[PDB]
Amino acid sequence: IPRFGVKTEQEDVLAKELEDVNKWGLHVFRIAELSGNRPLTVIMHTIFQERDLLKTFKIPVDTLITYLMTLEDHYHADVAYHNNIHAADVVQSTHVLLSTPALEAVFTDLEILAAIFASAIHDVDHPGVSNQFLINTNSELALMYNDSSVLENHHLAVGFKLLQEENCDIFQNLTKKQRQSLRKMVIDIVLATDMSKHMNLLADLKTMVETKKVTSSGVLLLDNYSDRIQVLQNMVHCADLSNPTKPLQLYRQWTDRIMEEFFRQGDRERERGMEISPMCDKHNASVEKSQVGFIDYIVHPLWETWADLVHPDAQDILDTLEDNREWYQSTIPQ
Template sequence: EHIRRNIEYAIAVMESRYVNRVVEIPDDEVPATLSGEGPVPPEIKRWLVQTFTSRRADVRGRKESETRRSLRSVVHAVQAGMFVERMFRKTSVGVQNLPPEVQEHFKNIDSWSYDVFELDRISDGNSLKFVFYELLNKYDLIRKFKIPLKSLFAYSARLQRGYRKYNNRYHNPIHAADVAQSLNCLLVSSGFVHWLSDLEMFSMIMAAVVHDLEHSGTTNTFHTNTRSPLAQMYNDKSVLENHHISSAFRLLNEEDCDILVNFSKDDYPSKEARTLMIDMVLATDMSQHFGQVKKLQSNLQHPESLEKSRAMCLMIHSADINHPSKQWELHCRWTERLVVEFFEQGDQERKLGLPLSPLCDRHTTMVAQSQIGFMDYVIKPTYDVLFDIFRNVNGPVVRDAILSLRRAS
């Protein structure tokens, strides 16, 4: 009876708070601090502007969907009984599908200091495969969507093969596993996991594991400057990101790889699930970074207007760039790998007679200062916004629920 009254009270609170309203700002707005004077060298500022901004006119004025996926949808979830199920969600066992050493390692999968390199070692290079399985299993999505294990492991094997296509030092299956695991940490530690439907949870996990599929080890700028086939296919717009998500969907058509075979027509191929996956992967395009962060900063002036899908996109993006926020050993290891890819791109640009991209010249790049600039101008502002989302959106609901519980007792 206490639970019933508290849930009814929670519904009333959320109905009064979450209004479907959006405040728009230009996608390509850059923080004023970036154009001012600061300790970061000009080359690094140029890299930040080139990498994390976009001035394409076509992204302006784009109409929002008539049916926005706002945070008000959590009310509908409560009324349908989903919210209660999320709060008491139980992990499936599935022991027979994981090696014992991997099972033991996964006891810390909710930890921000989780060592995905060690997982890759003990799993014989199958970190992505096992993280994908573990997260789907953890949230009982394999059972709920009747995902055939044969198809799941076949699809995972194809994903790992696709990530190894160019033998990248950084953008490889270990990175994809790390992003998925970090996303899980954000969902669990924030409580956001309780707000998501099963379909939204599946979409987020799926987006995390495929977000860099068949990455070439070079940037979008390199593709456009060299007029690569991918750049021509996608008209220079989020070239790699469009390729990643397109490849992920295309893999589902390969033999024994259709993990969505038992999804109901209401779930997939539904416009919501497909749109969510596409939006989240495209949100990992670094050129959209400042616009994405500024738009959410504006939305947070009126937290009730924040769309859930925008928060989901920022969480994927934050998980993608997570390593400077991890402990030093992990951050240092990821940085060394990323620098290898940058320098290899610079070598290619030098051979082709192209201007070297920022931070890609192995002879002049200051790695330490570049990381300081990245942390100051990208990581900290991003995680500040993420914290504000969790505090301003989750906070009032949690506070009111606690007050309700106290009154009930």
């Protein structure tokens, strides 16, 4: 892209938008257009520089870029929601959640690295259909993974596998112990993004909130791996379920996209003679009521608990969610 050092018309604008990377409600769709459909690459790269991770872990810049481009390529450009823009968004959302005052200096550089990396790979090579669809159609993926966290195991396998491609091992200068530790954390995190685990994960988070302990500066105290990994699992899970907490213009576009992917699964189901899964029937749809339902029973309970953990750091995020819930409610057709 560059031309004799000084920046292009677009590059300048992209660079301007990337100044918002520490903010909730980054214009992630603008960044995707401006970057030539490379939101994951430029946002990861920007975040790594901001956190000084290339120096801390001796990551060569060219290896980082080469890996990010290869990883981004393996998200499907023809899947409406579970694509590279989603991955970029979850990465950036996790990045902001990591900077919350209630967790200052709680996580090591390595844990910070695991959470961002996990976020980047968390839906890679998603085919645009659910675990239950993959199980019900007796797919190769479901067969490989024995019906258990089918997609999530696959996102991990592809994520780690791509590190072994030419000039792609972004972790080449980590010690053996660091590589082990990072690999384990990443697996624990991504496996917890499986939506069938939400209830168990939320219930454990609640327990932690009720028995919450903080240090002599309001900062959250975490004694052991169990508690540390649990917070990172919920953090990334929250980032994954962050669309309803973003400014409405971002939220609506996320909803438009997920409904398209869902409807596309339902058509495929209908062509095979199967029952149409919840949310996937374009002839029996209720988009607004469904978003209200998803917020009340799933997203709000999660983010409310997260907000308690980090109180009051996440109040604005919770207020936007509530406002967006009010708005969708108000639209429900009579």
